[PDB]
């Protein structure tokens, strides 16, 4: 996997984010997701890889573009790709927090090829955090005690993040009961998980259930940033079990370590769409010296080098023209 | 009003914010609000003013501390004090975005002494924006068209902010219909209004109904930053009309210009509690060089100088100790 | 020239900067310059170009690249070998790329330069044959400011004294760098640099490089080559230059599709230098600060990169 | 010493820096020094202290304003004042790096009343640095070995800062010989020393001879930030010895520990004039949203709380008017 592909992936997430931003707060989820899918597919087909989507918009049944198995790329090293063209159920359409475009790449077989089902997740940051510090089968209380001990802080210092959902009431109650502070995001548990390993995020732990593709993407990031994570797939009906069986998953209650989610040489890239607790959103800027432009804020990382690059890009644009020109 | 008082106010908002943060995401809206009231009252009694609370926690009936008419301060120039010990009590409770501590000061008579009623609000930023660019009795479409022409952008470039509430459904649709992007905040229309005048917020217009104290405080900020705002109090019951004559307000359908909400020599200060559209929240930091501390982010502005100060403060703290040590 | 090449170029400047930093302030010109060169050549040979060095072991005419579109390469493995070696300000690693024939193929001679930033600056706003006063008056009018607000930048050198005197006399503020007129020129177009204008004589390679950047960021510049010795004249003639007194517009220095990349080695008026950082969460790393830009898209990318490293190991492990 | 004086001091250093900036690069060190002195004097007399200048512009013989012994302030707690209206008059006059305006306050007697003589200095940052880590009679190599051990790094990682002067050749050579990296500043060893305790300075150790007033000022900062320093006055002729006996100093070869230079409850404030390796300089800014303004960057800190505040101030201004209007 050539060292060039890392920086080429940022451009993909950037184009996808600018497309999404044209639809931000337009109250049309479908238009936002389609802008992002279109931009991200068109841009991947300019990347020099022999890519196979292993995590994408769905099965070829359901999704015309970026479907499982889709081959993408102009040609190059053989890589498996994990994609989230636009993170968020409604975030972008309402202008909510933590909207993101996400892309990861691994050597063939480097990702758990997750169906879109729910996944329980627990994650903590820290390059020196040891395996076993978090376990999904331990109580919230014991995981938090171990985290607090390793970080050297009183329990009330710890900021636990989870999604505002009824399914998380118990996590919330138990964490508050043992003294921690528990903040709630409305969506976007890729940002929520990775925040545990980002400087100055104000987030120490992530506990919650969210999308499985998002779990894998976040594990990719933390593979690069340092941290520990445990996840478990959840199945609501028999068709989800069939999807897993077709992907090779038969131990349905397997606990995946972070190394089982993403292994080997990993590249992870994301661009912000709206402001979130990982990356800021796209912004319109006017400057006399340099004119008007959109600003995107992105991050690309690589597990083998451990290199992390934060990127602020200025894309020239005459904002007298319609914003949908940012679509591809 | 001495030049000393401006910088002194930021210490008040900082202490109120640290107190509030100790309660962030504890799910106890009362405990947060009173942590912040108690820190702020103690901190104000060390400020060198002869201050009278004209906007506060309520009337002496309902509020033991920071009630209307309360005298505060160690002694000094006579000023009216408009405060919000915690803008976003529920916010802070769930660690949502846009929670703030806020304090403003004017010479005697400088604020609209707003009762606790609702208030229609429209705001735009820009230090060259003309009086009349926005008006509450015009349609959304005509206001946005004037704003778009004044900023020199296509309508789809504009980002309108409003609170996610049934009462704004019509603003939202109308703004979307005429081509603008409309983003929704869950709470915190002080931040929402002030974002319009803050560099790189990504918010161009605020349109909404919220708390009247909040609109006076936001108007105070905008008087310092540059912008235009129009507001009107709403009275739903006879009791609200009674609070108004008790504060001396009798012209119920008055539309207030920004000069009618905050006039003369105005100081505005605020500190972030959580991350928001205006300020970053409090963060725990560890460094080998200096040890561990809480970092706060604050702004303090004065209208006569137009001086705006961005303040990042590092407050030493051993986080092996209980976070409630930050209280009072 | 394919929209990859821009993001590939930053990696070249980043690697050369880490290598240069390992030699920072060590007092060894040669060891710095050979760390930088070695890393830049190795990184460039991973870039997908048929590159030919036209300005700049990395000798003029050297072919570099793994293979691709045909491009002219202007390079400064270490702009400020002296600079990195004494730990001075404004040490940068730099790379620019243009389509074939896009750069003035400048001999390594001195060059008079004047430059101002701004996307709407009309050509002729600066001209080397106008007085310093009239240049500055036109610039102050264009920026909408009183003359006393202008900050003019030049190098602290005897040859610049008349510039300095005249600019002060007409009321401007005139600041002096000790070297690094790549960064000095490009600061006129770098926001918040506090530099409005650059006037002075410096290396012609360095002038081409700055022109490539301003072509991307917006601004104007004029230059003229200076020949003090017969050898320099011969070296121009062998490059095809025979109008020794030509004034060059910015477009004559760098034209067409251009990519410019740089990474700071020491802190300077354009970029911060490389820093050792420790964090409890992330561990320890060197931070680089880079910029890369392209004239056809006018896309500008600011890049802060964290390179994980155990600083109990020798710093020369950042060499290539 | 009330907490109110800390934030009042920043305004002083801001006013002096703006006045200095009006003279930056004008080639007239006199006019710069005088604009700074005038501004600092006037602003000081608005601060609520009973202040005595113990370090200032000179003796009443040579300096009409801010002379040793001068009383300053509007009235308040009694403090000794150590002033540098303009650290870097020559710096400012050429537009060089590391010009600062500086103000430090302490309880009566808490500064070394430094004479205008040269001072050998060595300094390192870090709150856990033990007294004795640096000593002027140990070799440069042994100081650097202890410092590398304390920072937990290979010697080759250390960055040593000194000034580019003949008198420092042996420092430079020895640091290079034992494997360290050595960066050179042309002037401004207040900033050079304080950078050792400043985040992201890239400077680990300061070693060199410079001004003794400047040594005291930097020691005050390091008492607030964490670090260790040693200093020794040096004397090149009788007039210099007389300067010391006039201030009561008779042990001419005393090695001063940091606690001998500044002790007790210290407030340190500084505003950058030019960009340096501790603070950024004053900049002209034009915003479409906010209009045009001068931005100053300051820091204020206190030794007893260890609170540090970083302050970015935007001073509204029409730059069509002459820059000398920033004078006082
Ligand atoms: O320049 P010298 O005479 O060699 O001594 C250095 C001392 O003077 C300074 O360089 C300040 O000089 P200026 O205020 O005139 O610029 C200090 O930073 C330093 O303390
Ligand atoms: Mn998605
Ligand atoms: Mn409130
Ligand atoms: Mn060179
Ligand atoms: Mn001075």
DSSP string, A189-226: HHHHHHGGGSTT-S--EEEEEEEHHHHHHHHHHHHHH-
Q: Determine if ligand 1 sits within 6 Å of the CB of residue D96.
A: no
Q: CB distance A199–C282 less than 8 Å?
A: yes
Beta strands A308-316 and A291-302, pairing class: antiparallel
Q: Which of C262, C250, C258 is nearest to C90 (CA)?
A: C262
> Residue B287 — φ and ψ, nearest 5°?
-135, 145
CB D188 within 8 A of CB C32: no
Distance CA D125, CA C231 (A): 52
Ligand 1 near D187 CB (within 6 A): yes
Closest Cα partner for B282 from B88, B10, B18, B70?
B18
A18 alpha carbon – ligand 2 mean position (Å): 14
Query: Collapsing DSSP states into helix, strand and coil, what is residue B39?
Result: helix
Using CA atoms, how far residue C187 sits from A246, C9, C268, D20, in Å, is 58, 21, 10, 22
Dihedral, CA atoms, B172, B175, B177, B182, nearest 10 degrees?
-60
Residue with tokens 């106008």: C130
* Tokens 């821009």 -> residue: C6
List the residue whose alpha carbon is closest to atom 14 of ligand 1: D88
Q: Determine if residue A33 is labeled as part of a ligand binding site.
A: yes
Residues C263 and C20: beta-carbon distance below 8 Å: no
What is the number of the ligand 1 atom nearest to the C-alpha of D93?
Answer: 16
What are residue B124's phi and psi, to 5 degrees? -140, 150
Considering only CA atoms, which of B227, B231, B235 is closest in space to residue B207?
B231
Q: Record the tokens describing residue A253, joined without a space.
A: 């209650």
CA of D13 to the centre of ligand 5 (A): 12
Cα separation, B313 vs D310, whole angstroms:
6
SS3 call for D84: strand
Q: Where are the alpha helices (DSSP H) in chain A?
A: 5-22, 29-44, 91-94, 140-151, 169-177, 189-194, 212-225, 238-247, 258-261
Residue A53 belongs to what H/E stretch?
Answer: strand A49-55
Left, alpha or beta for D51 (phi > 0: left; psi -120 to 50: alpha)? beta
Q: CA of B88: how far to CAs of A101, A140, B93, B94, B185, in Å?
A: 30, 28, 8, 10, 12
Nearest to A230 by CA among A90, A131, A95: A131
Any alpha helices (H) in chain C, and if so which ranges?
Answer: 4-21, 29-44, 81-86, 132-143, 161-169, 181-186, 204-217, 230-238, 250-253
Closest ligand 1 atom to D119 CA: 20
Cβ burial, residue D55 (10 Å; 0-12/13-18/19+): buried
The secondary structure element, H or E, covering residue D41 is helix D29-44
Say whether D286 and A286 touch across the interface (CB within 8 A).
no
Q: In what order do the strands lie in the sheet with C197-203?
A: C173-177, C151-155, C197-203, C110-117, C219-226, C247-249
Query: Which helix (DSSP H) or strand (DSSP E) does residue B144 occupy?
Result: helix B140-151
Indicate which ligand has the atom closest to the C-alpha of D191. Answer: 1
Smallest CA–CA distance, residue A182 to chain B, in Å, is 5
Residues of C with a Cβ under 8 Å from any A Cβ are 3-4, 7-8, 10-11, 46-48, 117-120, 189, 191, 217-218, 279-283, 285, 297-308
* Phi and psi, residue B309, nearest 5°: -120, 125
Instruction: Identify the helix (H) or strand (E) that includes residue D259.
Output: helix D258-261
The experimental resolution of this structure, in angstroms, equals: 2.2
Q: How many CB atoms are located within 10 Å of the residue D299 CB?
A: 24
Collect all residues with Cβ–Cβ distance below 8 Å to A226 and sequence separation of at least 6. Answer: A125, A126, A127, A128, A129, A197, C281, C282, C283
Distance B41 CA to ligand 3 centre (A): 13
- To test the contact with chain C by mutation, choose from D202, D208, D292 the residue with the greatest count of C C-beta atoms within 10 A, namely D202
Name the token pair of B77. 């120039």
Token code pair at residue D62: 């040579």
- Sequence-distant (6+) residues with CB within 8 A of D55 are D68, D81, D82, D83, D84, D111, D113, D114, D213, D216, D217
Task: Indicate yes or no: CB of B184 within 8 angstroms of CB of A94.
Answer: yes
* CB of D8 sitting under 6 A from ligand 1: no
Is C303's CB within 8 Å of A290's CB?
Answer: no
Neighbours of A170 (CB within 10 A): 10
Report the candidate in C258, C246, C176, C267 with the shortest Cα–Cα distance to residue C204: C246
| A159–B25 C-beta distance less than 8 A | yes
Facing residue for A284 by CB, picked from B157, B160, B295? B157
In whole angstroms, give the CA distance from residue A164 to residue A142: 22
Query: How crowded is residue C59: how many other Cβ atoms within 10 Å of its Cβ?
Result: 7
Residues 6+ apart with CB under 8 A from D138: none
Report how far apart the first and last C-alpha atoms of chain B are (Å, whole number).
27
Q: Which residue has the tokens 């389509």?
A: C99
Q: Minimum-distance ligand to the CA of D212?
A: 1
Q: Which residues are D105's β-sheet partners?
A: D81, D267
Rg (CA), chain D: 19
Residues of chain B contacting A26 with CB distance shorter than 8 Å:
176, 181-182
Residue B185 alpha carbon to ligand 3 centre in Å: 17
Ligand 4: centre distance to CA C247 (Å): 23
Name which of B1, B223, B285, B307 to mutate to probe chain D: the one with the most chain D Cβ atoms within 10 A of its Cβ.
Answer: B307
- Strand B77-87 with C300-308, pairing: unpaired
Q: How far is D289 from chain B (nearest CA, A)?
A: 4
The verdict on whether residue D214 carries a ligand-binding annotation is yes
């Amino acid at each position: 996997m050539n060292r060039k592909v890392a920086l080429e992936a940022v451009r993909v997430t950037e184009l996808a984010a600018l497309a999404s931003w044209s639809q931000m707060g337009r109250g049309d989820k479908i238009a936002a997701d389609q802008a992002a899918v279109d931009a991200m597919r068109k841009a991947l087909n300019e990347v020099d890889i022999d890519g196979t989507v292993v995590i994408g918009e769905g099965e070829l049944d359901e999704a015309p573009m970026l479907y499982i198995g889709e081959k993408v790329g102009a040609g190059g090293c053989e890589v498996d790709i994990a994609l989230d063209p636009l993170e968020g159920t409604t975030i972008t359409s309402k202008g909510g927090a933590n909207a993101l475009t996400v892309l990861a790449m691994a050597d063939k077989g480097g990702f758990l090829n997750a169906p879109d089902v729910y996944m329980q997740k627990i994650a903590v940051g820290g390059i020196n955090a040891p395996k076993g510090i978090v376990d999904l089968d331990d109580s919230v209380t014991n995981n938090l005690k171990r985290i607090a001990e390793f970080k050297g802080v009183h329990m009330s210092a710890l900021v636990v993040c989870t999604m505002d959902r009824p399914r998380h009431e118990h996590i919330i109650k138990e964490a508050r009961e043992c003294g921690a502070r528990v903040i709630l995001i409305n969506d976007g548990d890729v940002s929520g998980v990775i925040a545990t390993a980002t400087e100055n995020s104000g987030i120490d732990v992530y506990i919650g259930t969210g999308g499985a593709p998002e779990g894998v993407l976040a594990a990719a990031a933390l593979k690069c940033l340092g941290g520990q994570m445990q996840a478990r797939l959840i199945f609501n009906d028999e068709e989800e079990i069939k999807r897993a069986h077709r992907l090779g998953i038969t131990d349905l209650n397997k606990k995946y370590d972070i190394d089982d989610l993403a292994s080997g040489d990993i590249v992870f890239a994301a661009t912000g769409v709206t402001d979130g607790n990982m990356l800021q959103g796209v912004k319109r800027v006017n400057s006399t010296r340099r004119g008007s432009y959109a600003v995107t804020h992105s991050v690309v990382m690589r597990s083998t080098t451990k290199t992390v690059r934060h990127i602020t890009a200025e894309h020239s644009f005459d904002f007298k023209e319609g914003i949908e020109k940012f679509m591809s």
